[PDB]
Amino acid sequence: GSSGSSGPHKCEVCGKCFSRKDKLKTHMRCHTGVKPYKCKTCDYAAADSSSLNKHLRIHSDERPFKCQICPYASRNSSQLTVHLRSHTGDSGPSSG
Ligand SMILES: [Zn+2]
Ligand SMILES: [Zn+2]
Ligand SMILES: [Zn+2]
Fold first, then answer.
1. What is the largest CA-CA distance in the chain?
2. Strands (E), the chain
3. Counted domains in the chain
4. Ligand nearest to C-alpha 43
5. Cα of 52 to ligand 3 centre, how many Å?
6. 48 to each of 36, 45, 53, 55, how far by Cα in Å?
7. Ligand 2 mean position to 83 CA, how many Å?
8. What's the helix, strand, coil split of the chain in %, to 5?
9. Number of alpha helices (DSSP H) and beta strands (DSSP E) in the chain
10. How far, in Å, from the CA of 54 to the mean position of ligand 2?
11. Which residue range is the domain that position 10 belongs to?
12. How many angstroms separate the Cα of 17 from the Cα of each of 11, 22, 28, 29, 48?
């Protein structure tokens, strides 16, 4: 059997309180952007990866270092050293 669940649904996305489900249901119409390509700081969404990649260009950031396991990056090597730690279960090659 099922009891059911309900409650208030605020447009946290922007911060608009909506009690009438009918209202919100449509309110979303505005927030319609399911693009996995979004800036790090800006709220811009691109369809094609490249698009986002280029957008990052304008942003002056010196990140010569780049992790292997993850596409992560750091301005200094030191930072990367501590970052790696994260990768605890790094399944890879190992002789012996
Ligand atoms: Zn909203
Ligand atoms: Zn940006
Ligand atoms: Zn990493």
1. 65
2. 37-38, 45-46, 65-66, 73-74
3. 1
4. 2
5. 21
6. 9, 9, 9, 11
7. 24
8. 30, 10, 60
9. 3, 4
10. 9
11. 1-96
12. 6, 13, 12, 15, 33
